Design a protein around this ligand. Structure first.
Ligand code: HEM
Ligand code: HEM
Ligand code: HEM
Ligand code: HEM
Lengths: 138, 146, 138, 146
C-alpha cells in the first residue's frame, strides 16, 4: 500500500505540476506514442500527429484522472471507478502498457521540474502510478 | 537490432554531454531506493540503511559511475553491443543471479535521470532512441542467462 | 480485487487439496528449485536435494500459509503478517520470484486434480496467488 | 543455447505422447480466459464472450492445434530454433505487435496443460526441460524486437 509518506510525496508533486496538468498530459501521450509506437494501435481512430486536437484533448483527460487519484489517494479504486471497465473489459489494454505510460509521465515531470523527483519522491510516485495501473487493469 | 542514422546521432550527441559521475550516482541510488529488493546484491557496499545513506554511500557513487561508463561503451560501438557486454552477462547471470527484469528497471531509471539532466533537449525522439539503447543493453546482458 | 467468484473458486480448490497441502507444498518447492534453480540462492543453507527432509519441512509451512490466506480470503494482509517483513525487508525477495512459485503451485494442482483446475478456476487461483504475493512484497 | 542429453531425451520423449489438437486447443483457451486482454488479438475468431464460448469456439481450437504444432517444430530441431521461428517472429512483432511478455504467459499455460495431461510423469525434471524449451521458443519469437 501507499504509506503516509508516499501520499504526502505524491500530493506534493501534484501541487507543483497541477497548474500544467493539461500540457503534461499531452506531452506524456506524445512521448508514449513516440517512444513505444506499438501503443498507437489502441488509438487507431485518433489522428496521432504532433499537436493533434484529439491527443491534446485526451492528455488533458488522462492528467485529470491522475489529479483525481492524487486528490482521493486514500481510496483510488473508488475515485477511478468508471475507467476500470473501460481499460480492462472494453479496450483490453495489455497491462504492460501502463508502466510505459507511467514511465513517460515521470520523464515529463523530470524535464520540467528538476530536483522535484528526488529518489524517495520518485519511489513514492512509482508506487502511486502502480496502484493506479492496478485499478485500471482489475 | 538496426540503428538508424537519426538514432545514432541522438544517442552520441547526448552521451557527449552526460556527466557520467552525476548521472551514474543518481541512477544507482534510485535503483536501490525505488526498487529496494535490489539492495540484496549490494550489501558489501556498506551503509544502505536509509535513503540519505544510500545517496551518500561512496560505493554506490563509484559503482554508479562504472555502470553508466558501461552504457557509454554501448554508445561507442552501437553495432557490437552483444560482445561488449559478454563478460558482464556472465557476471550478472551465471554468478550473481540478478533476474533480467532488473536490467529493464535500471534502464527506465536512467531514462528518468537523463530527463532531469537535460530538460527540453531530451526530446521525444531522443527518449525513443535512448529507451531502445537501454533495451538493447538489457538484452545483451541477459544473453548468457539464456 | 479478487471477485466473489474468485474467492469461492480458490476456497473450493483449498477445500479439495487441504488433506494433501503438506505434500503439495513440498512438491511446489521442489519444482521451484529444479525448474528455476536461481531461486536456490535464497536458501544457501538448506539441503536442496530431491527428497530432502528440510525442503519438506519448509514446504509444509508454505502450504500452511497459503491455507490460512485462503481461509481469511477477505483479509489476507493480516493473515500473513510478519511473513511480509521476512520476505520484503530481511530476505529481499525479488518480486518476479513469487510468480515462479505460483506457477509451480499451479502445476502441482494440475497434476493431482486436473478436473478441479478448469480455466476459470485457474484464473481465480492466479489472482489469489498474486494477492498473497502483493502482501509479502509490501 | 545448450541442451544436455538428459534434457534432449525428456523433451523428445514427452513430445511423442502429446495429443496436439487437444493440448493446443486447451492452452490457447486458457490463455484467452486467464489473461483476457489476449482476446484483442483474435477479434476475427468471432465469439470470445465467455469461458464456455472460448473453449468451444472452433477458430480457437483449430488455431490452438497450430500453435502447439509450432512447438513440435521446435522439438524436432532444438539447435535450429532461432531460424525455425524467424517467419513467425516477424508476424508476431512487426505485424501483430504482441508484447513478448505474452509469449512467456502462453509458455506457462502450456506447461500447466502438459501437467494436467501427464500427471505424475510430469516430474520436476520434466518440468524443468519444458520450461527451458518454452523459454527458448518465446525468445526465438521475440527475436525481431531485438
Ligand atoms: C495509467 C494511467 C491511465 C489513465 C489515468 C487513463 C485514463 C483514461 C481516461 C481518463 C480516459 C477517458 C475516458 C473516456 O472519456 O472515455 C481514458 C480512455 C482511454 N484510454 Fe486510458 N488511461 C491510462 C492508461 C492507458 C493506457 C496504457 C492505454 C493504452 C496504451 C490507454 C488507452 C485508452 C484508450 C484507447 C481510451 C479511449 C480513448 C478514446 O477513444 O477517447 N489508457 N483513459
Ligand atoms: C542493465 C544494465 C546494467 C549494466 C550496464 C551493469 C553494469 C555493471 C558493471 C560495468 C559492473 C562491473 C563494475 C566494476 O567492474 O566495478 C557491474 C557489476 C555488478 N552489477 Fe551490474 N549492471 C546492470 C544492471 C544491474 C542490476 C539491475 C543489478 C542488480 C539489481 C546489478 C548488480 C550488480 C552487482 C552486485 C555487481 C558487482 C558489484 C560489486 O560488488 O563490486 N547490475 N554491473
Ligand atoms: C506464496 C508465496 C510464499 C509463501 C506463502 C511463503 C511462505 C513462507 C513461510 C511460511 C516461511 C517460513 C516463516 C517461518 O518459518 O517463520 C517462509 C520463509 C522463507 N521464504 Fe517464503 N513464501 C512465499 C514465497 C517465497 C519466495 C518466492 C521465496 C524466494 C524465492 C521465498 C523465500 C523464503 C526464504 C528464503 C524463507 C526463510 C527460509 C529459512 O531460512 O528458514 N518465499 N516463507
Ligand atoms: C510463444 C508462443 C507462440 C507460438 C509458438 C505462436 C505461433 C503461432 C502460429 C503457428 C501462428 C499461425 C500463423 C497462421 O497460420 O495464421 C500464429 C498466429 C498468431 N498468433 Fe501466435 N504464437 C505464440 C504466441 C502468441 C501469443 C502470446 C499471442 C497473443 C496473445 C499470439 C497471437 C497470434 C495472433 C493474433 C496470430 C494471427 C492469427 C490469425 O489471424 O491468423 N501468438 N502464432
Amino acid at each position: 500500500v501507499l504509506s503516509a509518506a508516499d501520499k504526502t510525496n505524491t500530493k506534493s508533486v501534484f501541487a507543483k505540476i497541477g497548474p500544467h496538468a493539461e500540457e503534461y498530459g499531452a506531452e506524456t501521450l506524445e512521448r508514449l506514442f513516440t517512444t513505444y509506437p506499438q501503443t498507437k494501435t489502441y488509438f487507431p481512430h485518433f489522428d496521432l500527429h504532433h499537436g493533434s486536437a484529439q491527443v491534446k484533448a485526451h492528455g488533458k483527460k488522462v492528467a485529470a484522472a491522475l489529479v483525481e487519484a492524487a486528490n482521493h489517494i486514500d481510496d483510488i479504486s473508488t475515485a477511478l471507478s468508471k475507467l476500470s471497465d473501460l481499460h480492462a473489459q472494453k479496450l483490453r489494454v495489455d497491462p504492460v502498457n501502463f508502466k510505459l505510460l507511467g514511465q513517460c509521465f515521470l520523464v515529463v515531470v523530470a524535464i520540467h521540474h528538476p530536483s522535484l523527483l528526488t529518489p524517495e519522491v520518485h519511489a513514492s510516485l512509482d508506487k502511486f502510478l502502480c496502484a493506479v495501473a492496478n485499478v485500471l487493469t482489475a | 537490432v538496426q540503428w538508424s542514422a537519426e538514432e545514432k546521432q541522438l544517442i552520441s550527441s547526448l552521451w557527449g554531454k552526460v556527466n557520467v559521475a552525476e548521472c551514474g550516482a543518481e541512477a544507482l541510488a534510485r535503483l536501490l531506493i525505488v526498487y529496494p529488493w535490489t539492495q540484496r546484491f549490494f550489501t558489501s557496499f556498506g551503509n544502505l540503511s536509509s535513503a540519505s545513506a544510500i545517496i551518500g554511500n561512496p560505493m554506490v557513487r563509484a559503482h554508479g559511475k562504472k555502470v553508466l561508463t558501461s552504457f557509454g561503451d554501448a554508445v561507442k560501438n552501437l553495432d557490437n553491443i552483444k560482445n561488449t557486454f559478454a563478460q558482464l552477462s556472465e557476471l550478472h547471470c551465471d554468478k550473481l543471479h540478478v533476474d533480467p527484469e532488473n536490467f529493464r528497471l535500471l534502464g527506465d531509471i536512467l531514462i528518468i535521470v537523463l530527463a532531469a539532466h537535460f530538460a527540453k533537449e531530451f526530446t521525444p525522439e531522443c527518449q525513443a532512441a535512448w529507451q531502445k539503447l537501454v533495451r538493447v543493453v538489457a538484452h545483451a546482458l541477459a544473453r548468457k542467462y539464456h
